[PDB]
Design an enzyme around this catalytic site. Sequence first.
Site, mmCIF file in Angstrom:
data_model
loop_
_atom_site.group_PDB
_atom_site.id
_atom_site.type_symbol
_atom_site.label_atom_id
_atom_site.label_comp_id
_atom_site.label_asym_id
_atom_site.label_seq_id
_atom_site.Cartn_x
_atom_site.Cartn_y
_atom_site.Cartn_z
ATOM 1 N N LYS A 160 0.829 -1.195 0.000
ATOM 2 C CA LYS A 160 0.000 0.000 0.000
ATOM 3 C C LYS A 160 0.868 1.253 0.000
ATOM 4 C CE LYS A 160 -4.217 -1.855 1.998
ATOM 5 N NZ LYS A 160 -4.054 -3.270 1.593
ATOM 6 N N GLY A 192 -8.180 13.673 26.980
ATOM 7 C CA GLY A 192 -9.365 13.353 26.207
ATOM 8 C C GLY A 192 -10.563 13.222 27.124
ATOM 9 N N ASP A 193 -10.278 12.892 28.379
ATOM 10 C CA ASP A 193 -11.318 12.678 29.385
ATOM 11 C C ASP A 193 -10.623 12.671 30.742
ATOM 12 O OD1 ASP A 193 -9.942 10.279 29.579
ATOM 13 O OD2 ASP A 193 -11.553 9.033 28.772
ATOM 14 N N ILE A 222 -22.602 4.042 20.276
ATOM 15 C CA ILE A 222 -22.851 3.401 18.991
ATOM 16 C C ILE A 222 -21.562 2.731 18.553
ATOM 17 C CG2 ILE A 222 -23.395 3.745 16.528
ATOM 18 C CD1 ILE A 222 -25.173 6.030 17.240
ATOM 19 N N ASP A 243 -9.953 10.326 34.232
ATOM 20 C CA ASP A 243 -10.023 8.981 34.804
ATOM 21 C C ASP A 243 -9.646 9.069 36.286
ATOM 22 O OD1 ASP A 243 -10.454 6.192 34.621
ATOM 23 O OD2 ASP A 243 -8.313 5.804 34.365
#
Length: 329
Positions: free
Chosen positions: A66, A183-184, A100, A186
């Site tokens: 590739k 990102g968040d 989702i 914890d």
Amino acid sequence: PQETLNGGITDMLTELANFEKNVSQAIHKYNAYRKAASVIAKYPHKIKSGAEAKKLPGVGTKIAEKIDEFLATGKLRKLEKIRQDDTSSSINFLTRVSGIGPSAARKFVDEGIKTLEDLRKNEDKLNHHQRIGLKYFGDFEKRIPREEMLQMQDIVLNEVKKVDSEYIATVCGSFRRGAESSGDMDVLLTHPSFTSESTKQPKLLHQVVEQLQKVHFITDTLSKGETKFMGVCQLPSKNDEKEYPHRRIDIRLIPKDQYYCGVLYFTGSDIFNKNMKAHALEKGFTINEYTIRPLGVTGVAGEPLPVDSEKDIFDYIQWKYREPKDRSE
DNA sequence: CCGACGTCGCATCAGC
DNA sequence: GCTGATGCGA
DNA sequence: GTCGG
Ligand code: NA
Ligand code: NA
Ligand code: NA
Ligand code: NA
């Protein structure tokens, strides 16, 4: 290393990774492509051929091919094709909504639901998590600057101590390592009353989540049991000014005798964890996120060793204690 | 050639 | 109703 | 898809 070094190649491999995971449901190919992109991202030379790349661990025959096509043509036929495909592009997209996954995304698209607008119109088909994911779709994709992490930590540490001053709480993740953005958030939580053999007392976590809800810091709940909470939180809007984005926050309750193994592991980084795991084996120990245990001569794991701090772990395996800020590898 | 590639807590589905 | 499987996230 | 027993 600058993105213009191999950014084209790495972007390509990451896009391939996402299609394997979200559309083909081939999780191991997702990770193979991710691994290849990681090693290439780190490579401090502009790659000139598939053969050069193939030398790197995780880059095999097919990715080498590739890279050859990409280098000669500035694109990849298969990737161009899948980008254009309405079904695949939609399935891939829908997975950016928290809750989702590939299965739900597939099912929605099968029944003609392909866009956030479509989702917006079909609330009855969405579970609770998915509704919250949709609700905060944009906010969840934003990063959190360290200054906001510090403000958030201030709140979490204050309210936890207010509930019971014997709780111990630690914000982990790259933030603990000194990252400039997260990102968040914890949070690992423990309490002396809770060990691997004693009360599993099922209100320790609830009381903390409750107080954080009471001061209107936690705004939504994705999931909550006796040991793990995942939800949404928001800094109070510093007045007259724009309101802060809603943020993802996880809080887990860990037995005290397992707390430091937990902090070590959830502080990372992943590569550091891997290496530390290697070394410990060499010294005849097996470490996971819960415990560290001696291995006997025929490889039988004995009982978990007492751990009362991160450094105890390092000491068991004869490693100098290393600060979170130095745990990239 | 061919299986491994973390594991697990929670919400929800599938089945009895 | 219950148990186990599956989806999902991290 | 890549690695390795
Ligand atoms: Na290779
Ligand atoms: Na998702
Ligand atoms: Na996603
Ligand atoms: Na107290």
